[PDB]
Structure 1
Amino acid sequence: LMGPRRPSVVYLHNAECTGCSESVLRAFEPYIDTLILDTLSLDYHETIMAAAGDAAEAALEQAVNSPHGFIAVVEGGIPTAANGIYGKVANHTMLDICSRILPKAQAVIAYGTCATFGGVQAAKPNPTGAKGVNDALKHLGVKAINIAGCPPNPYNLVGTIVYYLKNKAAPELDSLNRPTMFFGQTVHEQCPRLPHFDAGEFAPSFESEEARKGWCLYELGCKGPVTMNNCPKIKFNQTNWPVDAGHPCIGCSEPDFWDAMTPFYQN
């Protein structure tokens, strides 16, 4: 898969929707072709890799056991109920897969709220006992860098990897193990509608003239004040973000947000 030269990345998919992988495909300057050809060696990734079945399993072993070392990027929560059986790949539970592989990584990045905190399948009543990576694997000493969002900004993944490769270390992390360079500000403090919030100028409904005029979406449920992310600054796809599209923030980079931030249209 890899040998010397480019740093090896092993990308794993647990209980996920593949939205985080799709977000990586949206990488901009650098784009994903530069990342895969020049920056990194993407040595396992079930969504785009050529090999399948036994050949994919051999590709993964070859990467994980390389003397050159690898970085793990993990998408999805780990289902732990009923001894892990709710999620299997190659007939191994995801819990087992991740327990065997992640302690061998030089660094682990949990990419997306599912991998970081449990995510959507961990919302009540959590039938599969889905956990974030660090929760699930605490006992093995795994401490993944958490890049939260649903999905995160891919700027934040690339920036973290670049930093790690340059500095041979994790960047400063917050108390949720998220990089402070991306997660140090609330969405709200960065929001263009903040002057309306301060003036108590709130849209009372989506059809209202106040919404048309771009008034604050707090009364319609916006969780910007309690959410740490860089959305207003970086935006998505080089062009927009939820509140500029007129819709409240739903809190998607926070732990337990499915249950803590709901109902999404109330504050």
Structure 2
Amino acid sequence: LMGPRRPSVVYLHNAECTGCSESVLRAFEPYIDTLILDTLSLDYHETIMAAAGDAAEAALEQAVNSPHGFIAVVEGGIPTAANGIYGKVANHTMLDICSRILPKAQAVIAYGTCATFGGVQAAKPNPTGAKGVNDALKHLGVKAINIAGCPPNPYNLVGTIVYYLKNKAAPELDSLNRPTMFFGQTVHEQCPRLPHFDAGEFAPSFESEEARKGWCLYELGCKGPVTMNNCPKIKFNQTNWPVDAGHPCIGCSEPDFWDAMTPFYQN
């Protein structure tokens, strides 16, 4: 599915909404066709691969056991309650699958806040016992690079993979294992509304003339001050990001944000 030449990527889907996979399809310069045909060899990916069933499982086995080595990119939290049964693929629990495959990877990237920190299904009361990859697999020595966001900026995935392929090492990582080159600033310190924040100019409601004039969204719940991401700088889809669309940041690149940042419309 891959031998020499392009580095092999094994992409796994655990408890996920596939928004992280969709974010990678939005890759721009390079686009995803360049990535799949020239940069990398995408050797397992349930959303777009041709094989299904037993043939898909054999494709996975061939990739993981390759003497050329592979990189794992993991989307979704791992459900650990009740011995892992809330999530299975090919009748194996996602916990078993990731426990057997991720220790064999040359590098692991946990892509999206669900794979990094547990995400939406880990929000209280966490009925499926969902955990992020490093939490779930601590005991096996797995240390995934965490690229957070819900979904992350795909610029941050491609930039981390390019760095790793060039330097054969992870980039500098923060205390949440996220690359400092993308997650070293708060959203707020990069925000165009920062002068209004400083001036105490807050929109009191979304219908207000202050919201129309682009006043700061802190009183309406914005989590920009407590959230590390590069959204105002890179933007999304080469055109926009939440505060420029008039909506507060909900803190989506931070651990446990579903419970820490809620109610989303309060600060």
Q: CA offset at residue 175 of structure 1?
A: 0.1
Deviations 1:131-161 (A, max 9, x none): 0000000000000000000000000000000
CA distance in 2, matches of 1:60, 1:84: 20
Deviations 1:42-85 (A, max 9, x none): 00000000000000000000000000000000000000000000
Deviation at 1:254, TM superposition (A): 0.0
Counterpart of 2:69 in structure 1 is 69
1:63-117 deviations in whole A, cap 9, x for unaligned? 0000000000000000000000000000000000000000000000000000000
Kindly report the root-mean-square deviation, in angstroms, between the aligned alpha carbons of the 2 structures: 0.1
Q: CA deviation at 1:200?
A: 0.2
Tell me the secondary structure at the aligned position of residue 83 of structure 2: helix
| Residue 264 of structure 2: aligned partner | 264
Is 1:133 aligned to 2:133, yes or no?
yes
Instruction: Give yes or no for the alignment of 1:123 onto 2:123.
Output: yes
CA drift of 1:19 comes to 0.1
Q: Secondary structure at the match of 2:259?
A: helix
TM-score when normalising by structure 2: 1.00
Between the aligned partners of 1:173 and 1:83, the Cα distance in structure 2 is: 32
Give the C-alpha shift of residue 37 in structure 1.
0.1
CA distance in 1, matches of 2:35, 2:4: 16
Residue 186 of structure 1: how far off its partner (Å): 0.1
Distance 1:90 1:24 in 2: 25
What does residue 182 of structure 2 align with? Answer: 182
Deviation of residue 4 (structure 1)?
0.2
Percent identity of the aligned residues? 100
Give the SS at the match of 1:98. helix
Q: How far apart in 1 are the matches of 2:64 and 2:199?
A: 55
Instruction: Deviation per CA, 1:183-216: give whole Å up to 9, x if none.
Output: 0000000000000000000000000000000000
CA distance in 1, matches of 2:148, 2:227: 11
Q: What is the CA–CA distance in structure 2 between the aligned matches of 1:5 and 1:167, rounded to whole Å?
A: 17
Question: Secondary structure of 1:137's match?
Answer: helix
SS in 2 for 1:182: helix
Runs of 4+ with >3 A deviation: none
Q: CA deviation at 1:165?
A: 0.1
TM-score, normalised to structure 1, is: 1.00
C-alpha distance in 1 between matches for 2:3 and 2:138: 30
Q: Which residue does the alignment assign to 1:6?
A: 6
Could you tell me how far 1:220 is from its partner in structure 2?
0.1
Cα distance in 2 between the residues matched to 1:61 and 1:183: 34
- Partners in 2 of 1:91 and 1:175 — Cα distance? 35
Q: How many residues align?
A: 267
- Can you give the 5+ residue segments of structure 2 that lack an aligned partner in the other structure? none
Cα distance in 1 for residues equivalent to 2:244 and 2:200: 18
